[PDB]
DNA sequence: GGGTATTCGCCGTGTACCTCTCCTAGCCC
DNA sequence: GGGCTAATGACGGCGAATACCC
RNA sequence: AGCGGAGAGGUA
């Protein structure tokens, strides 16, 4: 990505874009959607994500 | 084609009729409970296509490995 | 850009490079030294073998993440097999003893 | 070209070893490592898409180009394993065998 | 991460101890008081040591 | 016999990213 | 057009090979 | 339909 200074955050945390967080943690999103029961298969969960 | 075992589980056995995949879980009597189909070209990912079958053979009463 | 599952090559089972064709970012040579300066062998073995290079670990880690269990399998990468098959084609015997 | 039931074959290799040894290669070791010889240099046949017999990209020496398939089409099923043909002898094995031998 | 520096002298032993503790909460173990923060709190509360981890591991190996 | 004195040859020269084009070619009908 | 058919604008460091005065 | 190598330009 491109770095950008942000003063309203602590030194133990950092910022992250939402689309990058969706594309990086996508199997964890699939596992959480399987555990919560809102999507039966991974194909329906992926279609609900996109 | 003919039904070939996955050899990752002891319960279910599947087949391959080209670019599509189908599976069918079975009890000791050989009766099929559920049966679906999956498309590998529609997914576009190999470990996601592995996890699809590994979850379909998990939630539908599938026996795990020995 | 970002990616989780992408295409692999034919020589070495590794993801591609670049924003096009879903290529992951290259882990540099000095980044491995910066990781090994901290120690932390578990995050160095998981970011070198089961993430990209293994043809079985890349599916097993995905299956363990989607399913829920936590049991990883460590093994030799495919690139070392390609290297030893290339060395064996030079009339030099090299066997994994 | 495309394999589906081969993706779930887990726990196939262990690779448990202690040391790495390197030495010279005897000619008998090279003759036992290989599966055949080559005599005609031709890596891609023209006017048809088939591997050249006893060439650089061959099927009787290394293995099949398609997974669980042969060149002609006499044995085109997964139930026949380890059965070679007579006009083009290819071992009907996995597609991973083209990198090892 | 700062409280755990006083209960143990080795940081890598603390990492391996929390890794041995994290393999039990994934299969289902009732906690003491994310599994990482809970395991670090159980370490820093001076409750989980090397003997109790071996006891739960032996109980899991016997009840497998 | 002998102990260096030029002399020839082998070795190497940071990391990561973004965009574009162009590849084996040729020859007498 | 076509279808098969086959250069001289790098630079420094180190090890072997004759070889030349002593 | 996925996978290759060269040449040039630009940011740090
Ligand atoms: Zn044949």
Please describe what this structure looks like.
Chain A: Belongs to the RNA polymerase beta' chain family. The structure is cut from a larger assembly and holds two copies of chain A, one copy of chain B (66 residues), one copy of chain C (97 residues) and one copy of chain E (64 residues). Chain B has 66 residues and is an alpha+beta fold. Chain B has one domain (1-66): Double Stranded RNA Binding Domain (2-Layer Sandwich), CATH 3.30.160.560. Chain B has two helices and four strands. Chain B has helices at residues 40-43, 46-59; strands spanning 4-5, 13-16, 20-26, 32-39. In chain B, strands 1-2-3-4 form a four-stranded antiparallel beta sheet. The relative contact order of chain B is 0.24. Chain E is mostly helical. In chain E, 66% of the residues lie in helices and 0% in strands. Chain E has helices at 4-7, 11-25, 35-44, 50-62. The B-D interface holds B 1-2, 4, 6-8, 14, 16, 19, 21, 40, 46, 49-50, 53-54 and D 2, 4-5, 7-10, 77-79. The complex binds zinc ion. Zinc ion is lined by residues 70-72, 74, 85, 87-88, 90 of chain D. Chain C binds three DNA and RNA strands through helix 1.
CATH class category name of chain E: Alpha Beta
Total strand count of chain A, please? 0
Structural class of chain E: mainly alpha
Distance between the termini of chain A: 21 Å
Helix content of chain A: 40-55%
Helical proportion of chain E? 55-70%
| Quaternary organization | part of a larger assembly
Q: Which term fits the overall shape of chain A? A: elongated
**Total number of helices of chain E:** 4
The CATH homologous superfamily of chain E is called RNA polymerase subunit, RPB6/omega
- Would you tell me the structural class of the helices and strands of chain A? mainly alpha
Estimated radius of gyration of chain A: 15 Å
Tally of discrete structural domains of chain E: 1
PDB class: transcription
Keywords: RNA polymerase, transcription termination, anti-termination, RNAP clamp, phage, transcription initiation, P7, Xanthomonos oryzae, Xp10, transcription
Entry title: Cryo-EM structure of Xanthomonos oryzae transcription elongation complex with the bacteriophage protein P7
Chains A, D: DNA-directed RNA polymerase subunit beta'
Give a concise summary.
Chain A has 50 residues and is mainly α. Chain A has helices spanning 18-24, 26-36, 42-49. Chains C and D meet through helix 5 and strand 1 of C and strand 1 and helix 1 of D.
Which descriptors apply to this entry?
5 chains, A: 50 residues, mainly alpha, 0% strand, E: 64 residues, Eukaryotic RPB6 RNA polymerase subunit, 4 helices, DNA-binding, RNA-binding, DNA-directed RNA polymerase subunit beta (chain C), DNA-directed RNA polymerase subunit beta' (chain D)
């Amino acid at each position: 990505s491109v770095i950008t200074v942000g003063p309203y955050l602590k030194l133990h945390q950092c910022g992250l874009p939402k689309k990058m967080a969706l594309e990086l943690f996508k199997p964890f999103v699939f596992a959480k959607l399987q555990r919560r029961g809102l999507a039966t298969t991974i194909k329906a969960a992926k279609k609900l994500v996109e | 084609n003919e039904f070939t075992q996955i050899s990752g589980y002891v319960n279910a056995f599947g087949s391959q009729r080209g670019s599509v995949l189908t599976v069918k879980v079975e009890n000791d009597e050989g009766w099929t409970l559920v049966e679906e189909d999956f498309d590998r070209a529609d997914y576009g990912s190999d470990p996601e296509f592995v996890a699809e079958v590994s979850s379909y053979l998990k939630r539908n009463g599938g026996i795990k490995d020995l | 850009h970002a990616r989780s599952t992408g295409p692999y090559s034919l020589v070495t089972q590794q993801p591609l490079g670049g924003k096009a064709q879903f290529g992951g970012q290259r882990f540099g040579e000095m980044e491995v030294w910066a990781l090994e300066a901290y120690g932390a062998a578990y995050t160095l073995q998981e970011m070198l073998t089961v993430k990209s290079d293994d043809v079985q670990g890349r599916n097993q880690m995905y299956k363990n993440i989607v399913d829920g269990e936590h049991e990883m399998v460590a093994g030799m990468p495919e690139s070392f097999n390609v290297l030893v098959k290339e060395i064996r084609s030079l009339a030099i015997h090299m066997e994994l003893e | 070209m495309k394999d589906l039931l081969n993706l779930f074959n887990q726990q196939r290799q262990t690779l448990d070893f202690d040391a790495i040894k390197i030495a010279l290669a005897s000619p008998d070791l090279i003759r036992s490592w290989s599966y055949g010889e080559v005599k005609k240099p031709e890596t891609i046949n023209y006017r048809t898409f088939k591997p050249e017999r006893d060439g650089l990209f061959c099927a009787a020496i290394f293995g099949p180009i398609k997974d669980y398939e042969c060149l002609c089409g006499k044995y085109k099923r997964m139930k026949h394993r380890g059965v070679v043909c007579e006009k083009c002898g290819t071992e009907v094995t996995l597609a991973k065998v083209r990198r090892e031998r | 991460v700062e409280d755990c520096l006083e209960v143990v002298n080795n940081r890598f032993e603390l990492v391996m101890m929390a890794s041995k503790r994290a393999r039990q909460l994934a299969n289902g173990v009732q906690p003491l008081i994310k599994p990482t923060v809970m395991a670090l709190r159980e370490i820093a509360a001076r409750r989980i040591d090397n003997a109790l981890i071996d006891e739960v591991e032996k109980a899991e190996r016997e009840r497998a």
